[PDB]
Design a protein around this ligand. Sequence first.
Ligand SMILES: O=P([O-])([O-])OC[C@H](O)CO
Ligand SMILES: [Mg+2]
Length: 418
Amino acid sequence: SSDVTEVLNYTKSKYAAPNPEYFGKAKGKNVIYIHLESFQQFLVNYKLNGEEVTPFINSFFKDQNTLSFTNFFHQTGQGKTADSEMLLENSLYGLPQGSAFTTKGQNTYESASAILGQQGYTSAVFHGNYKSFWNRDEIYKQFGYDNFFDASYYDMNEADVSNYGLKDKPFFKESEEYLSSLQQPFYTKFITLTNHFPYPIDEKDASIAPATTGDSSVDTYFQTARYLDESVKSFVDYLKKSGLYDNSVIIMYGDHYGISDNHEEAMTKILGKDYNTFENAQAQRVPLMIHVPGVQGGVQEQYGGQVDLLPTLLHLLGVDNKEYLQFGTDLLSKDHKQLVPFRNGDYITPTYSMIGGNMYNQQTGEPIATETKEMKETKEKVAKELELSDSVLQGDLLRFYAPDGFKKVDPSKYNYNK
Ligand SMILES: O=P([O-])([O-])OC[C@H](O)CO
Ligand SMILES: [Mg+2]
């Protein structure tokens, strides 16, 4: 009520207006999210022993129609993969502890699948694991996802299944039948899973040798990244052959880090510089590559986070999001602020960053002993933003508010069983 009012006053004052060069430039197009599991931005153009680890994704990165972000950060917490989903579908953060998917599965949401539903978009999630995991079966219905093609829809023979479920290559290949019979325009997300810690892979599935740092999970990380790269290349081939490549916004993104801060000696070797607390913060960059048919792309260096993605996508589709309780801003807008909150209260700006609660020069990596007024102000803005987002989840505030003309999801109308 007055909680709803405080949040909307905050979000509306933050709102960044669309860029006229990009607004609606993909109106009516399909959306295909390619979820790169545990994939960090440092992998892009990375060479292991003279050899590109992820060559197809590198080519996608540089494609003429691709908007490619080099300073884009994950903003997840203990909810991990489920947190990135909360961020992408709602422009809401996960919780400061535990998993929002687990505990807020019966909250009211006004998510991307619902917003695009208003305009006749069909929606679907594809995932090679069972719908019970991370409580997806429950919360997707509140999101208004028309479909959830989970492991029940796939051939889970033991040759094709890993320890998290179906491997990416048979997953993408068996998804084609389902995607091709989905009514267009559609809104879809493909959640991959082979690239999970500690990154095991059979020798015969591996086309690249492990790194040689002596840290097992860092060394085989490159091998599962390469395998994921190859599976994604096959998927895009299908998309080109089926004609979906030309009528869809295809978005590759990473959900969270692959290597933790507990592998400093190995990551020192991998990145060629001392992997200290600052560098570890810098390693929280994940890819964001938005391929838009007919629009000139280019490298995007403006700082941003996963919270900013839904406002960015909606503006590309020609949909205005000003009245929605969403905490991110359009990444292509000139009014987008280059400020990236972490879930623990840390933050990244192009000049100064707070990392582990301490201040650093973002350009040089040098510690700054004392917070200035400006650093303190930014810190409190970040704490305020996270608190208001938490107030939406903890207060279940979307019960009490929807933008005018928005029609709400009836979650009882969805069933994902075969
Ligand atoms: O134990 P580590 O290597 O720090 O990290 C392990 C992963 O974060 C758990 O999935
Ligand atoms: Mg993940």
